[PDB]
Amino acid sequence: ESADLRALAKHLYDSYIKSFPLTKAKARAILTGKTTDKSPFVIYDMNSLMMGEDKIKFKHITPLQEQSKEVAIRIFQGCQFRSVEAVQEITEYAKSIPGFVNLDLNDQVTLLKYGVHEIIYTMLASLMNKDGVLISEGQGFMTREFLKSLRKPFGDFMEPKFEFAVKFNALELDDSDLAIFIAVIILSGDRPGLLNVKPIEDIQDNLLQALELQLKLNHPESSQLFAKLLQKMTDLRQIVTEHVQLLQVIKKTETDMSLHPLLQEIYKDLY
Amino acid sequence: ESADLRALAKHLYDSYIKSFPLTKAKARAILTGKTTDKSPFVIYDMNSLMMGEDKIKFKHITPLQEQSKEVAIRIFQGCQFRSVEAVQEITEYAKSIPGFVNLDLNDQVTLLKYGVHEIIYTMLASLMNKDGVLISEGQGFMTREFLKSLRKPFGDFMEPKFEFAVKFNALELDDSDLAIFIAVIILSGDRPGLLNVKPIEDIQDNLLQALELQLKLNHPESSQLFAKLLQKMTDLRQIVTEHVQLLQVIKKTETDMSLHPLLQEIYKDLY
Numbered sequence: 001e002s003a004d005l006r007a008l009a010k011h012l013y014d015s016y017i018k019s020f021p022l023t024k025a026k027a028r029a030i031l032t033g034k035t036t037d038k039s040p041f042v043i044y045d046m047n048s049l050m051m052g053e054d055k056i057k058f059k060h061i062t063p064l065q066e067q068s069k070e071v072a073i074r075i076f077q078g079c080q081f082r083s084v085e086a087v088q089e090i091t092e093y094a095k096s097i098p099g100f101v102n103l104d105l106n107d108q109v110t111l112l113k114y115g116v117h118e119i120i121y122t123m124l125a126s127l128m129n130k131d132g133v134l135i136s137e138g139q140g141f142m143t144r145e146f147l148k149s150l151r152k153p154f155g156d157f158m159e160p161k162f163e164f165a166v167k168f169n170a171l172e173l174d175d176s177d178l179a180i181f182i183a184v185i186i187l188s189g190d191r192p193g194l195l196n197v198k199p200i201e202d203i204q205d206n207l208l209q210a211l212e213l214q215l216k217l218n219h220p221e222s223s224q225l226f227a228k229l230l231q232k233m234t235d236l237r238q239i240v241t242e243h244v245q246l247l248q249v250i251k252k253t254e255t256d257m258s259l260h261p262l263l264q265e266i267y268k269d270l271y
Numbered sequence: 272e273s274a275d276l277r278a279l280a281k282h283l284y285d286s287y288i289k290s291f292p293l294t295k296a297k298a299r300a301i302l303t304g305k306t307t308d309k310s311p312f313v314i315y316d317m318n319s320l321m322m323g324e325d326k327i328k329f330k331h332i333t334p335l336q337e338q339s340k341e342v343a344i345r346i347f348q349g350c351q352f353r354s355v356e357a358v359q360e361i362t363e364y365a366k367s368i369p370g371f372v373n374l375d376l377n378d379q380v381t382l383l384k385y386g387v388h389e390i391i392y393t394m395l396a397s398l399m400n401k402d403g404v405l406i407s408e409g410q411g412f413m414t415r416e417f418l419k420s421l422r423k424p425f426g427d428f429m430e431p432k433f434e435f436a437v438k439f440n441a442l443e444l445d446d447s448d449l450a451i452f453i454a455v456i457i458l459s460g461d462r463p464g465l466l467n468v469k470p471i472e473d474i475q476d477n478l479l480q481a482l483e484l485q486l487k488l489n490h491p492e493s494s495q496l497f498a499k500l501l502q503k504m505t506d507l508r509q510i511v512t513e514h515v516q517l518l519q520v521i522k523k524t525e526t527d528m529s530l531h532p533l534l535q536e537i538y539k540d541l542y
């Protein structure tokens with residue numbers, strides 16, 4: 001039913017605004033300059049990075065760890081911290097998705113374990129453009145060129161996400177759209193080790209309907225926007241697999257690395 | 272006018288029926304012996320428990336967790352699992368209380384965050400009699416005696432809710448009464464961190480009027496039920512402070528640390 005599907009859309013959007021501090025609308029305002037409260041410090045090379053990290057004078061020290069390593073590894077650690085925080089926000093949002101908490105508790109973990117990074121790259125695009133990405137709660141902007149030039153492996157962890165973002169952002173989705181798309185990703189019946197597949201697919205079918213209606217009602221001039229959005233779901237999967245492999249590379253080229261206890265669990269036995 | 276207050280009550284009752292599948296009328300019929308045809312499985316001890324635990328799995332894999340830990344901890348974890356489910360139902364009901372979704376987003380989160388526990392205990396009384404509580408949407412019935420027999424910490428974690436349900440159920444409230452009372456509790460202007468108190472009080476004032484007329488009409492012979500009902504909140508606030516306080520001890524003296532990413536994160540400045 002339309003009325004129902006519209007209510008679900010409205011619901012997902014609300015918990016989305018509640019679960020994710022930096023939305024696309026806000027990210028865009030900062031990137032476009034439209035907003036007015038604090039222009040982002042730009043990090044595009046080694047000297048601006050030092051000044052950006054030590055910029056800590058009027059801006060206190062983020063909850064993330066300090067440092068005592070090289071640049072590449074220090075960015076890797078910042079990506080981990082930030083990624084761990086995202087996971088906490090996505091889990092909170094996942095709980096508001098009608099049906100999700102009613103699922104077998106093991107499948108709730110499985111859908112989270114496999115859909116988390118897919119969601120992190122999808123939403124990370126909201127903070128990107130072809131020249132860089134907003135960091136530190138929209139406080140800074142690290143250029144694509146800088147991140148791409150990091151010694152060997154580290155650089156390849158970044159560029160892929162950018163090529164994805166540039167194509168994903170051409171779809172022009174907004175928060176209300178993304179709120180439903182994210183939910184479609186989490187309720188994926190094809191995740192490895194799911195015990196009760198059908199109940200999860202029935203919910204996804206419902207969200208898929210809500211998403212289609214949402215796309216037709218918010219972008220009436222965008223032909224097949226629904227299909228082209230679902231296609232990007234394959235791009236996401238490639239990002240994660242690629243990422244998982246570069247993680248294997250890093251185990252051979254770096255010394256004591258070790259990921260955060262929460263990220264280690266997600267990657268334990270991951271495709 | 273009465274008519275508007277009565278129309279609000281009916282709106283609240285209808286939303287309530289949609290948000291909460293197992294109503295008091297339904298539960299009381301099961302707790303008694305109406306339409307004798309599906310007497311729930313009664314768990315009255317450890318053997319019966321495990322006998323019915325794998326009985327709601329003997330069919331298929333969809334419990335809350337299975338045998339592989341201390342029974343007391345496993346029952347405590349099932350309570351958490353169900354608690355997170357109830358939160359989602361309460362949230363959905365909240366959205367139907369006139370005025371709620373128009374409040375500041377942050378305040379909504381805050382009202383729910385502190386109100387849910389008071390609501391969960393209030394509503395659990397509908398599923399209890401002096402001797403036990405209906406579980407798994409009325410599929411099971413676990414005896415208060417058994418809940419009480421759980422080792423020291425866990426046992427006295429359950430009994431206070433039974434002590435509260437007996438005294439509460441003596442007020443003889445029905446679903447149409449409870450729908451309004453629930454709404455009154457959610458719209459409490461004294462929760463910590465509320466940004467706009469005035470509007471929350473204005474809404475609650477209209478609900479207090481609705482609840483009072485409802486009680487005056489539905490229970491004419493129950494002298495001052497309205498006042499006695501408001502007074503029960505002091506007992507609920509107390510029950511919550513106890514439960515929260517007892518949660519401290521549990522967090523400070525236990526092994527199993529695998530919980531639901533809701534209640535935990537939810538607790539903040541929570542008395």
Ligand SMILES: CCCc1c(OCCCOc2ccc3c(ccn3CC(=O)O)c2)ccc2c(C(F)(F)F)noc12
Pocket residue numbers: 074075076078079080082083084086120124133135136142147157158161243263
């Ligand atoms: C979600 C990370 C987004 C991100 C950036 O996005 C670029 C693409 C990031 O791709 C990732 C995402 C997650 C990552 C890594 C490396 C490890 N992880 C953690 C994980 O795999 O869960 C790389 C770039 C820089 C930062 C920083 C900074 F280092 F500046 F503090 N924090 O977060 C960044």
Ligand SMILES: CCCc1c(OCCCOc2ccc3c(ccn3CC(=O)O)c2)ccc2c(C(F)(F)F)noc12
Pocket residue numbers: 335345346347348349350351353354388391395404406407413418428429432514534
């Ligand atoms: C809402 C709990 C209701 C309840 C029961 O009610 C007894 C009183 C429950 O009191 C509570 C209420 C909330 C609770 C706990 C323990 C943790 N929580 C979550 C929380 O409030 O933080 C205990 C008893 C057993 C179960 C089970 C079973 F273990 F059988 F699967 N599921 O749910 C039960």
